[PDB]
Amino acid sequence: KAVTDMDINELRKLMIGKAIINSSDMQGDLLQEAQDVIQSGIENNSAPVLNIEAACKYIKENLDKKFGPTWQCIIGEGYAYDVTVQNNTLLFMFYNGNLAVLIFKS
C-alpha cells in the first residue's frame, strides 16, 4: 500500500487540486495573490477539454489589470525558453500532471 500501491496514473487521478511550485523569484506576498487567481481561472476556463489559448487569455487579462500593463504568461506541456525579466517580476509554478505554467512581468 502507500507509495508502492500508488501509480503515476493513480496519483494524477487521486489528486487534481495538488499545487507544486518549482521556481520562485517574485515576492511571497505577490505570489499568494497570483497563485489563487491562476488556479481559480484555469479551472473555470478548463471546460470539457482544457484549452491552452483559453487559459492564457483569462490569465493575461486578469494580470494586466492586477499589476502592470505588459504582463506575459505562457503555459505548455513541455518547453525550453530564455526570458529577460525585471527583478521580482517572474513566478514559475507547474500544476499536478503535465501542466507547466510560466508568468513574468515585462
Partner: protein
Amino acid sequence: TLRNKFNYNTRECQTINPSIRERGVSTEPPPSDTICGNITQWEIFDAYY
C-alpha cells in the same frame, strides 16, 4: 519749496524672490535578469511526488 517731507513721502517696496538653484536628478529602472526554464512531465511529477 512746495515739495515737503509731509507733502511727499517715498517708500521702497520689493517682492521676496526664492534663490534660483540648479540640481541634477538621474532615474534608472530596476535591474532585469535573463531566466531560462525547461519543464518536462517527469520533472513536474517528481516535484508532485
